Design a protein around this ligand. Structure first.
Ligand SMILES: [Cl-]
Length: 113
């Protein structure tokens, strides 16, 4: 299972937010994780990358990974999902399937300045 928290959150312009994902009840080894955002009113998600305002943290031992976004603006509103990547999926078809398992999402609204 991939447990994503929080489920929904509102923030003010200029605040930071953190989203967490943990892989529970799995034999797989976490290598890394990826993040995506769908803007409000769209179906289509696109990737986010570590760098600048975006700070990613991976904890292999706890099988968790997290995204912090600093200096939020209304442009950061949307629904975010995480996606884990297993370390040894090439050897284990169950863990290869982990690479396609997304968190349940976080619906984020950032209030105007
Ligand atoms: Cl694995």
């Amino acid at each position: 299972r991939v447990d994503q928290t929080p489920q929904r959150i509102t923030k003010e312009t200029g605040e930071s937010l953190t989203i967490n994902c943990v892989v529970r009840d799995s034999r797989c080894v976490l290598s890394t994780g990826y993040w995506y955002r769908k803007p409000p009113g769209s179906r289509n998600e696109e990737s986010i990358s570590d760098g600048g305002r975006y700070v990613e943290t991976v904890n292999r031992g706890s099988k968790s990974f997290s995204l912090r976004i600093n200096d939020l603006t209304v442009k950061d509103s949307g629904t975010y999902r995480c996606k884990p990547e297993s370390r040894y999926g090439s050897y284990d078809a169950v863990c290869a399937a982990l690479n396609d398992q997304y968190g349940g999402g976080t619906v984020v609204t950032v209030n105007a300045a």
